Symmetry: D2
Subunit: 304 residues, 4 copies
């Protein structure tokens, strides 16, 4: 009578939750054990492969992860997982040995989410603080708050009360099996770096990446993806010299749009829309497995 | 008797689609002030830089006695940075109010006119004094330390995301209910009157699989400081951590901030600052932490004194 | 080549926008002229009838309205409009004669929204401050701010930049032609009143309504729809005496849930979910045109 | 030397699923204070009332010299109301900190334990003094006037939605950056030491097609005041307006507030307060405007003096 749920563990600050046995038959597997500040491409490749391979062995997946880069992993899996069963990511803001630790109830709600049949076909989900959040818009909004995880542009899909979810939204951007990114045979990802804009910004980070032959650069622009003059110069050069350039923003909400202050087509640049720099990096890496044409990368940025 | 208010124009979308045309665009300003304008520069704030900052702060400090208040018209993109620099360096204790516009003056429902008006109202209010340098946008008075641009296009983008606004503006009047506690203006030791340049401080971003090359480049270039835009509570990808540990043992100041948009990068978390000679930025986001680090480095290179400065200002 | 758009005007603080001619052939009609603080049942009946009757005469509707009760009208139309062409509501926070008045660009964006073919089948929409918001979750969050209108539980559907909308969400709750509420032959609505909970609350408002024979009472509860003891007593009486009782909350976000501190089935009560008191009142009035069974009213509250 | 901190328990979900079991539930409290507990009542705060308010305020004022700080355990539902009443009536200038819990103590990841701890930390901090009565929830210190419950179930529900929090709590320490400007505690004229009851003030809601019957009922009952939960900027449906106009001309105090969850109900908007003898509530939401109106009516019935009180406190 209960669903089969596989917990895949990666570490982070998050048996000790026996009330799980009320809602699913849980099996645990250690994939890695790291703080997610050391999250990397290899871990991501491992996770997508495991999920895709093991899909027909379970009814859903919960991935325990650190909270620091949970938002990057959730979007990577959102674009590469082809399993059409729920994949829910979860962490904790307080250690398990601390007073009023969030990990037990968080895990419980993540299992609830992975077990719910209404959760399929919603893409990869993050479940934190009683809320089901899509892997594309979810981000860490505060450095220490238990309520930190929000979908700051388009909102949560669902709230969880008493083990039940009232879903009122689903992401429209294409995800999972509706994307072309197939990661099954890949052992590395294209090299993509992020540079930060501010007053009197150095061009040296952007130059270091270009000198290294990086495949992509994401700018964390000011305002609507704007670039400090030295940084602009160096990127405009990179984009005609073999490096794809995506303009995002350091600004924590809203789109980096087309048709603002930057002639994207003149420079061969791509506007990130609502993807923040770390998220744009995810979709840039995957675009680069398929194309290096900035027109075609911009299309990818317009659909996923 | 109306107050005398000086507008110092620097450019931005508010001056776009100089200063003398701005005033004539808002004649209602004559109802609340005698306004006089000076163009200091005319740049997009994406191109703001240490020299415009020194020029403004020197100018305000020099011209303090000649006016009753200052309004700075400025691009939105880096207004939060300029605001905090001026907050630490102006010694004038007449109000200094920054203002921009998120829509072009020629566009429908342009926010520039009513924003300017409100910035003047604020600079004319005797209660605006002794609150530090201010940002006035969308009917709201915001302190220069906490104010940040939250959204890429919304007219309401500017928010003090941790501690809230100082006061709200309705029908040309302000109900002030808050003032920043952190020391500002004439309570800081920072004196830029005889400074021709600022120490070099760069910013590096942290994410999964972060490259150390951007950090290495800034070390190779002999940077006086580096501000880390960390993950979560000021955390660093290992490669980045390692370059920044090595740098701090050879006299580069290293301040851990966070790419996360609200909350403090705290002391006593996952990083042993005292061990590496790193500084925790508190609620200062990376571009704000740069502002303070640059000024910290005019006084001191000691990591412990620099930490004390990040606890007071 | 341009869409036919009918502006229906009701008043509020919001020709003078000639740039409309770039995006549609606009026709205006005065239905009423009031401040929306005097919005009433008759105006709503008029509006739904007009839209339904005139549906095949236009490509979309923009309704100009005051901002005070725009959120109540948008949900009423959201449940009663059977036209499957966009119906967009719009107002202004600043008078048209004031500096940097929001009405021109707001109207422009509302027309953009009503003209967009992607806007059909999304229910009744409110467009304010560059944002397309669903009529069920949208509410006035601040007394004076131009950015006041937000969908505070589930987020916007879409942002508008340079005359274009990137839609990433649509409401899941049933709306428009997927609801049973047919208003075409009705000339009045069931009488529904709202009472407020706080410390030491008087039962006198609730009693006045009951004494008046009201069909429904919405409680603006404390917390998770809780009721001051005197008010609870009076409502528990009303619910067994011919008055339907819906528990909402004065709290501006989140659900009044089932299975919390109030035994709803014991008392014959209905939990409002995410509907605030004014919105619950809308759906209560319409439920009462079809049923007075609290089990069946609770179902309606669970689907619309 | 640890400080002496008194917990006054009133009930709520934190005391649920008295006071002596609460302490034993949080033994770590012994690391930061000598705690002593008194049960004052044991009710859900949905049932909070004028008598519990008088009892708490009298008690705190009486017992001020016998302890170093007070923590009040309380239901979440009306904590914002109690907090503001105590903010206007306690004359003790040791910290007074309110705390509840949104999950039951028996539930997974119960917030009650760590909340209590933080409330004690706050009440023990000498810097918490002279800031008025405080609410401590979700690692955040909030002033009693602005604090409100924003969400029906979230552990982070409590926010000062207009002017922000006072300070944040990390590893048992507080960085205070704000204090309320509005007069509180020993700067208010409100003295409830010899009061056996409070004036009668009710709340009426405004929406489309609003009934006047709830307003009429409160007038018929001879209410001393009525607080309107208005639409938008304190506006009233016509029937409601008319009953409340008639009432104010026969000595009922009428305060326009707003059902809208942030922002002020302003003077000089669509309602001519001076004409009807109405008062504008400012940022006080309806349940908060009641708190102040009740206390205003212990001093005065004049609409103009009551307006002045709504501008100062
Ligand atoms: N540094 C931790 C933070 C957490 O899990 O809260 C991690 O992300 O692995
Ligand atoms: N790029 C412009 C943006 C603005 O003014 O809104 C600037 O910062 O100068
Ligand atoms: N009282 C006006 C408010 C507005 O339109 O801004 C109305 O709702 O009609
Ligand atoms: N109904 C409870 C809610 C809580 O404590 O969270 C109370 O206010 O007493």
């Amino acid at each position: 009578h209960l669903p089969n749920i596989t917990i895949l563990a990666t570490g982070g600050v998050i048996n000790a939750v026996p009330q799980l046995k009320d809602i699913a038959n849980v099996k645990g597997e250690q994939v890695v054990n790291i703080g997610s500040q050391d999250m990397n491409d290899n871990v991501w490749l491992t996770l997508a492969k495991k999920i895709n391979t093991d899909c027909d062995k379970t009814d859903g997946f919960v991935i325990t992860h650190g909270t620091d880069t949970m938002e990057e992993t959730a979007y990577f899996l959102d674009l590469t997982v082809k399993c059409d069963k729920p994949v829910v990511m979860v962490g904790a803001m307080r250690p398990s040995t601390s007073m009023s630790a969030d990990g037990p109830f968080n895990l419980y709600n993540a299992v609830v989410t992975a077990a719910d049949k209404a959760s399929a076909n919603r893409g990869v989900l993050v479940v934190m603080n009683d809320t089901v959040l899509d892997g594309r818009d979810v981000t860490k909004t505060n450095t220490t708050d238990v309520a930190t995880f929000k979908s700051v542009n388009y909102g949560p899909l669902g709230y969880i009360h008493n083990g039940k979810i009232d879903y009122q939204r689903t992401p429209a951007r294409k995800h999972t099996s509706d994307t072309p990114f197939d990661v099954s045979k890949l052992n590395e990802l294209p090299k993509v770096g992020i540079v930060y804009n501010y007053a009197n910004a150095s061009d040296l980070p952007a130059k270091a990446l270009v000198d290294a032959g990086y495949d992509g650069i994401v700018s964390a622009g000011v305002g609507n993806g704007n670039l400090y003059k030295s940084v602009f110069d160096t990127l405009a050069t990179a984009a005609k010299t073999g490096t794809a350039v995506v303009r995002s923003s350091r600004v924590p909400t809203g789109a980096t749009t087309q048709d603002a202050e930057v002639d994207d087509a003149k420079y061969g640049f791509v506007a990130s829309g609502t993807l923040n720099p770390q998220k744009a990096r995810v979709l840039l890496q995957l675009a680069l497995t398929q194309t290096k044409d900035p027109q075609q990368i911009q299309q990818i940025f317009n659909q996923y």
